[PDB]
Amino acid sequence: ASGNARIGKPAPDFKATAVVDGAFKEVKLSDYKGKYVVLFFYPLDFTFVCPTEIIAFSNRAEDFRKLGCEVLGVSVDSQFTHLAWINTPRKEGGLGPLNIPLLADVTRRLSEDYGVLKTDEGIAYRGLFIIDGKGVLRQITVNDLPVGRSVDEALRLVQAFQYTDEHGEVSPAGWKPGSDTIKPNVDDSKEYFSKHN
Amino acid sequence: ASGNARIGKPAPDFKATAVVDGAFKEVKLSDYKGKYVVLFFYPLDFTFVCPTEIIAFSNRAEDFRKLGCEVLGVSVDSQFTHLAWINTPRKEGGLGPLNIPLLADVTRRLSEDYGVLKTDEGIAYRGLFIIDGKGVLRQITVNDLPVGRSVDEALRLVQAFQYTDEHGEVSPAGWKPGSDTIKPNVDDSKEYFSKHN
Amino acid sequence: ASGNARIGKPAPDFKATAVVDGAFKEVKLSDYKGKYVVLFFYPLDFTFVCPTEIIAFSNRAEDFRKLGCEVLGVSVDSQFTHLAWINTPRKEGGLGPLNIPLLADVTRRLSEDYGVLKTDEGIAYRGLFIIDGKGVLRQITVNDLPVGRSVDEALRLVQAFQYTDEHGEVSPAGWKPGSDTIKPNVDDSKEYFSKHN
Amino acid sequence: ASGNARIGKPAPDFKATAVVDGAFKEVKLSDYKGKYVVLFFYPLDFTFVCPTEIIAFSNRAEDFRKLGCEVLGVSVDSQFTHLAWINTPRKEGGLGPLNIPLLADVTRRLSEDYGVLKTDEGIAYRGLFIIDGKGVLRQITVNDLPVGRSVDEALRLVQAFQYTDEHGEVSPAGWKPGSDTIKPNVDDSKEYFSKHN
Amino acid sequence: ASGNARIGKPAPDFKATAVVDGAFKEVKLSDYKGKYVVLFFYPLDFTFVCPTEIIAFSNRAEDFRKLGCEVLGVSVDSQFTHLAWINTPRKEGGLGPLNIPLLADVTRRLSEDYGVLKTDEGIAYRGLFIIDGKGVLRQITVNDLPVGRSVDEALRLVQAFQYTDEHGEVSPAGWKPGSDTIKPNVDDSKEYFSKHN
Amino acid sequence: ASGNARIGKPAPDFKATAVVDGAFKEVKLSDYKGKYVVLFFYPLDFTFVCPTEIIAFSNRAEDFRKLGCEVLGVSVDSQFTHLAWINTPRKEGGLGPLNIPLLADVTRRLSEDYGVLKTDEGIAYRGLFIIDGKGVLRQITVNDLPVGRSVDEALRLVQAFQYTDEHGEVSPAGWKPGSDTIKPNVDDSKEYFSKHN
Amino acid sequence: ASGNARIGKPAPDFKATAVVDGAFKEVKLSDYKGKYVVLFFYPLDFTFVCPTEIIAFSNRAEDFRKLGCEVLGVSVDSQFTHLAWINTPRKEGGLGPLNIPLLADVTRRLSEDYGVLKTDEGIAYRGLFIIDGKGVLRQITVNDLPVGRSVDEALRLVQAFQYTDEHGEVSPAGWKPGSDTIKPNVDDSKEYFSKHN
Amino acid sequence: ASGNARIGKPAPDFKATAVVDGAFKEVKLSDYKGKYVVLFFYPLDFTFVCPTEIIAFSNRAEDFRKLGCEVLGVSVDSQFTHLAWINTPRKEGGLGPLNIPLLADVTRRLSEDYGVLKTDEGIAYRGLFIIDGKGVLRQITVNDLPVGRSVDEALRLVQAFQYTDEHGEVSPAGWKPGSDTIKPNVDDSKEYFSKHN
Amino acid sequence: ASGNARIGKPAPDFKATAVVDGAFKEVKLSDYKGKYVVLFFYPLDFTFVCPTEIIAFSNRAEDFRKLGCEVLGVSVDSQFTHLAWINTPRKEGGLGPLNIPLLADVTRRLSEDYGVLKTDEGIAYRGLFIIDGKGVLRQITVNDLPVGRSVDEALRLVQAFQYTDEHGEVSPAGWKPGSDTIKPNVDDSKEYFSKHN
Amino acid sequence: ASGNARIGKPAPDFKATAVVDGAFKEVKLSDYKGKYVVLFFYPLDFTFVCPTEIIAFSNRAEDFRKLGCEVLGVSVDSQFTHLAWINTPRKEGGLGPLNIPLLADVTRRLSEDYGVLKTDEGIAYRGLFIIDGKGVLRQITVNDLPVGRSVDEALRLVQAFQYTDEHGEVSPAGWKPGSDTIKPNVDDSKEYFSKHN
């Protein structure tokens, strides 16, 4: 409804200053050519649902990297606020040490380009975007503020998009690794339909 | 973020002819005031990922209804094509008897209003939308065509939005019924962060 | 009133996936250079007048091919729906095996280019168009939905256009093969007028 | 599909001077409210196909008026040229006495309103339009200049439109008086399909 | 007030099919380079004032041609109607054989370019235009429909424009061949003024 | 066809200072309601063709007044130049005593409204206009500068328009008082055509 | 307020037919490069204040030519009216023989370019313009119609503009030849101020 | 002819702070209704020609006031600079005590509205304007910067406009009190032209 | 000079969530009617020059309040970041307890409305604004990022505007409470000038 | 809000005639490349606060030049008014001899380019601008008219910008020469924050 994020088309490019391993570092979408990217927005640092989502993704950052997928968090907060929040204990609502980059959308350009900017508050909705190695947007997930996303589901989607990528098949509803896929043509799809019904 | 579909705003209204218990009947968004709605688009009838999603939501339809949530499917196909597909055995790629309405979007107005129309093919992306009893859009999920959605995650989101709606709290990442929520203010949020860290 | 189908001018180009001999194949207008084309639209698959028209043209398919004319049916339905309709017995309202291509116009591009789209329903009127071997539109026939067309008249028109094309004469009202044509000049036409009055 | 001539919409209004029983008289579409109207354009008086179409319709004008349908011929020629042609014997290419009005479209307004004007020559194509008693356009037929229309098919279409009007059924391909029509709903339509297949 | 005919400027070019010696022929202004042209429009064939004007100019055609001036008649009627009028005896209101071309302005292009089209009826006023051998418009005469023109005055005007072209003098009111002219300068003009007063 | 001068429409209104009987007087078109008006423009005072036209109309003004027709001359010159020209003897190129008003079009409004202004020189062409007692323009005559007009033809045109006005018939070519007119309908017109051919 | 005459900028170029020594001659601004020009407009020939200004400037023409300044008169009247006015004795309100050119602005271009055209009357106000040898407008003087201009003041200005051009000093109020000028700088100007106060 | 300054039309309204008898006071055009006004612009305070003009008008102020005419000076300088200049002795290039107001056009609105703003420098040319008691502009005078104006000519012009105002006559070239005026009609003007030639 | 911030006009209205005494509280410009306001922006929380300015104004807060002036700080950081920064000890670069509100401009509306937004980084320049008790903007101070502002000068300016407000006088350069002011009129201003020179 | 002065961007270029050492000289921004520039506008010469700000900056001119900073004063008054004011003793409200250039902005270009023009009065606000040696605008100070600026704060700001320029650090609030600056990164800024707290 706003922005430029479109399924099947190149994901909107982004460049931003990020906090990587307690240090400031520039991050841009071009750095991930050939790797999947899970870009997820959150409204504000030092809030409530946001830390649980950042922590949950950081704890499982390696589960995505094993698959060749890098996870990126972003809010409109500056990299100094990110660093401060990272230097705050998790028991106090902080992030503690983080295994994923944390971008600073101080210009709001990323949130606007991805159409997740809640304009009346100038903060980003809980928008999650899955981008493939070729820089093409594959998936969009946006939540209202009071409800957090699921890292399990985001991982399942990355897996499904990679498995259908290389084997040229399509994944049924609820597909998880190890489950059958469908050969997307009239004749060969009968194998799946006759087996599972 | 989808055509006229904006989170926090009234969901785009819709009226369409649908197949309900094997017969044609009108379906309007106004029919579901006071109830949650999961509206999910799929590209084409008589294809491959689509019947598995439609069948999944139909099997789980009562799980949503016991929560006061009505599930609706929709594609650009006519109700006559829907009925023919319903009358095709699932063993042959059909749908069999269904427990959810199947809306016909032959004017492509629903797909266009919810910004899920793949313009170069004229079919809707795998867009899913969660609307609350007040008619407000709460969640947007759009997958590329090769990968199906998750009914389990859709149910979790409906559950989290209903719970946070009732108790004025917010659900952390991966929240499920029984898990703790967070009191969204600086002071009371410490109860959760200290308990879980 | 809408579209680009003008008599005497090149027929609007079209390109679409079609069901040919139970398989999906691409169909272009350019594929018929040098041959006549009867392109007839119909509103919806699995309806009532449409099967009788499609079946009637399929039975007479060779009556047009003997004359170097190819018949093509089209509707906004997909090739997967077309194929399902073909695989439905005629006694049950289906098409059965078909002797003509059945194009899918899911993007509504063909219907809009040929100005037959019923906007308020998103379906094509019963528009029929006759195109000569040079890609020029010779005839337009659009019926409202309740009334089916006449395969006999379509054959008569193709015959008349081919005859007048070759001999440079003009066919009178109700002309059929074996009937007198008129030499379109003041002097030579007197032959016809004196004879038939 | 013809200028302002759109199926299912009110036919473009017209008012023109016409030759009626050898005298000049004003004719307007509103004069035929409650009756069907067959309005056929032809390019030029004192030509070749045109007299055969006018004569054929004239000879069968009473077959249409027995159905409550009025036949009207139109061309850009003036009422004086019309009358001169009526006063020319048919053996010499004239029309002789006529049993249908012959409107004069000297301003080209009717031809432009019905989208049949061949602009590079200033003459009307061979457009035929069927209008019901409510003034709604039901059928469009347009031939290139060298081929004449069929009065039989025009009468069949009038009959079909009046029959489907009265009984709420739909007429299949090639339907003629006395043949079966289809009940346009899924269940009741099976009667026809099993009987005729 | 309308059109492009302007005195002292190149006369609007024209090209039309005409009846010449009982046959059809293309006529265009460029055909008359180096010759004077009298182009007279008339509203409708088979009317009342028009045949007398056409007949008059036809009878006087050689008076004009002896001065190197060609006379052309034109109306919006087609060449077929022109010929049928020519084949009507003058006793019955026809033209009989003609010695001037009769142009068919069926596209109304000529009438519009010369600003004589009576828009509310689609017919040309009684506009007469004199053009010199260089294509430059010299005279405009336009009569309302009920009053015919004067061939004597048309001849007189052609004679005047030709005499003044050759001798660089100007012709006073009512000048005819043999009358005195005025040398157009203050000193030499006194010769005429002192003699004629 | 001249600026706002359209045949059959109300003649462009005008208001100008004029020399009448050697004195200045305002003249306006409404002054001549119920009377015919011959309004003739001429380029310049103290030139060559112009005095011969003005003098000719002056010498014959009473011939027009006997018919209820008032003649009016006009040029872009001022009333003071007009008066000086009237006070110049005709032997010296002057006008001498005049019997018609001589209007001053110093603002060029009349020439512009009547479409006769030679823009590159700012002077009026030899435009003559006939207006009936109802203010409707009936005749346009415009000569190039070097050729003067004919008072004989102007009078004949006034006689013809008043006769056709009064008796509802049309005057044929070269019609003069005493000659036959044509009753403008198909049947009654045969009287004239058979009598005169 | 209107036109292009801007002091300090190149004077508007003009090109007009004029009366020079009883004969017609083209006159352009370029003809006067290297000389001063006093261009004075007046409303109408054969009026009242105008002859006194044209005569006054004529009788004083040699005083301007001795300075290298040419005096030009112009009105919207034609050259034929000018000459008639020149050929009118001064006792009868004429100009008699003139020693200055009298330009004809029949197209009103000169009056429009110099912004002195009294639009509602089509005549020029009493505008006077002083141009220098380089074609630069130096002075504008426009009187309402009932008040004549002053040749003395026009001469004083030409003298002042030539002296200040020559000596690079500025002339005080009322300066005439022989009076002191001011050195336009702070220090040297004190010479004048101390001496004249 | 200056910005909004049109002779014969209401002079552009103006209001501005002025120095009056050594104090600051608002001065607006409406203050002088019923009195003549000479409004003269000058470029810059503390310059060279400007003081001599201001002083010249100041000394002659009562000569204008005895005629019912008020004199106003204006520049883009502020009133404080005006006062400082007034407090500067004349021997030092100052104005000394002043008998006329000195307006401050700091916004340049007066200079722009009267079309005298030398834009490249931001100062007013030496524009003088005479306005009558009706608020109508009667005279425009604009000198280039090096040459000062004549207070004598300004007084003569005021005298001439007031005289022609009261007596309905017109003043010839160089008129001064005592000289003859002209009765502006053809007949009565003869008295003057005969007496003076 | 700042977006909508204009000296002498109503200051841009604002409304924002702010941290006050360690808690969140809405703050709007209307709350400070009758009181002066010092609104100072700073780029980012947890940076370097900002805390020194914020601390300096907080330490002097009562000096401003004793004068009836309220000091407000604002950055584009959220109120949660502000609080966290306030809860960081000053020795750690935090703010520690504050005695002034800390507004959050996360929508950037305040920074945009006051024209201090560094667009390329999305942060506010070191802009300080002084608003009087009537809501009018009186002073603008904007510093480049690397140079902090002066609380002494800000206080001096508030005192100067309050003093000049109540006595209708003007404060010289460097004025401080106790020093002399100037009566802003020519005569009375001499008291100050002679005394201090 | 108006103009083109933006912090951190090249200062708007300017060129003007100025009074330097009692003489006129052209001044432009390029003359000060590599030097800091303090450009301060003031509304009007011969007023009250303005002379005290000009004298204050003049007496302190060398204090700025010792730092390589040049001070420029500018108002809309002309250089002639500047010089008259300089030649007025300070005791009488004048400036006396000056040690800084005084620019003349008679075209208001500078004031408009720097967005300090009080448009309703045509005078500049008390806008002070600090431009560095590279021509980049570093600081904006705009005071309402009745309150004078502080030279001490201007000097302080120039010192801070020059120190931060050279040492790549940032100066805290109230910094003056000899005080500590801050190393602008998270790790090194702790040196300042722990020492001073």
Side-chain angles (χ1 to χ4, degrees), chain J residues 20-31:
Chain J
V20 182
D21 251 289
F24 300 154
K25 175 186 303 189
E26 170 169 291
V27 175
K28 40 191 162 61
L29 180 58
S30 57
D31 297 356

Side-chain angles (χ1 to χ4, degrees), chain G residues 190 193-194 197, chain H residues 46-47 51 85 88-95:
Chain G
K190 298 301 189 300
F193 291 132
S194 68
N197 295 289
Chain H
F46 287 109
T47 54
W85 201 17
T88 296
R90 294 183 174 185
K91 276 171 157 284
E92 298 173 50
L95 302 179

Side-chain angles (χ1 to χ4, degrees), chain I residues 139-173:
Chain I
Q139 208 284 329
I140 296 174
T141 296
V142 193
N143 289 18
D144 204 355
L145 301 182
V147 171
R149 289 153 286 188
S150 157
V151 178
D152 291 320
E153 176 63 7
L155 192 69
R156 189 196 72 87
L157 289 160
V158 171
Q159 295 159 350
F161 282 115
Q162 284 174 346
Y163 187 96
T164 54
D165 272 357
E166 106 128 311
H167 301 286
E169 307 198 8
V170 300
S171 60

Side-chain angles (χ1 to χ4, degrees), chain A residues 66-96:
Chain A
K66 290 167 196 304
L67 299 182
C69 178
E70 297 292 340
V71 176
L72 303 178
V74 48
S75 77
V76 301
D77 292 302
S78 80
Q79 62 277 20
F80 301 90
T81 297
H82 288 345
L83 184 60
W85 200 19
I86 289 163
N87 293 331
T88 295
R90 296 186 175 177
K91 262 171 150 298
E92 316 224 0
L95 304 177

Side-chain angles (χ1 to χ4, degrees), chain E residues 1-2 7-9 46-49 51-53 55-56 90-94 114-116 120 125 136-153 156-157 160-161 164-165 169-176 182-187 189-190 192-194 197, chain F residues 1-9 46-49 51-53 55-56 90-94 125 137-153 156-157 160-161 164-165 169-176 182-187 189-190 192-195 197:
Chain E
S2 185
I7 297 287
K9 297 298 196 62
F46 289 102
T47 51
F48 315 115
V49 171
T52 72
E53 291 180 321
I55 289 165
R90 301 183 178 186
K91 286 185 180 291
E92 298 170 42
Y114 278 83
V116 297
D120 77 332
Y125 278 115
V136 177
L137 182 66
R138 310 304 307 281
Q139 208 283 331
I140 295 173
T141 301
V142 189
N143 285 16
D144 199 3
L145 299 186
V147 168
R149 284 159 287 191
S150 167
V151 183
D152 291 353
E153 175 64 0
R156 189 193 73 82
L157 291 164
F161 287 111
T164 52
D165 284 354
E169 302 188 16
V170 299
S171 59
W175 174 98
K176 295 182 179 187
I182 316 179
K183 311 187 183 156
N185 59 87
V186 177
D187 288 336
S189 64
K190 298 294 191 295
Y192 168 97
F193 291 133
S194 62
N197 298 281
Chain F
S2 309
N4 298 338
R6 296 180 292 164
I7 297 298
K9 301 293 190 185
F46 291 107
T47 54
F48 313 116
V49 171
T52 73
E53 290 178 316
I55 289 171
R90 298 181 172 181
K91 284 62 64 211
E92 296 162 51
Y125 275 112
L137 182 63
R138 313 302 307 284
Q139 207 284 329
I140 293 166
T141 295
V142 194
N143 280 21
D144 199 357
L145 298 187
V147 169
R149 288 156 286 188
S150 168
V151 179
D152 287 354
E153 177 59 17
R156 188 190 74 82
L157 293 167
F161 279 114
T164 55
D165 273 4
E169 302 187 23
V170 305
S171 72
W175 176 95
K176 293 181 176 176
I182 313 174
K183 311 208 232 304
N185 73 66
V186 186
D187 296 326
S189 71
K190 298 299 187 304
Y192 175 96
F193 290 135
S194 59
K195 163 174 181 179
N197 296 276

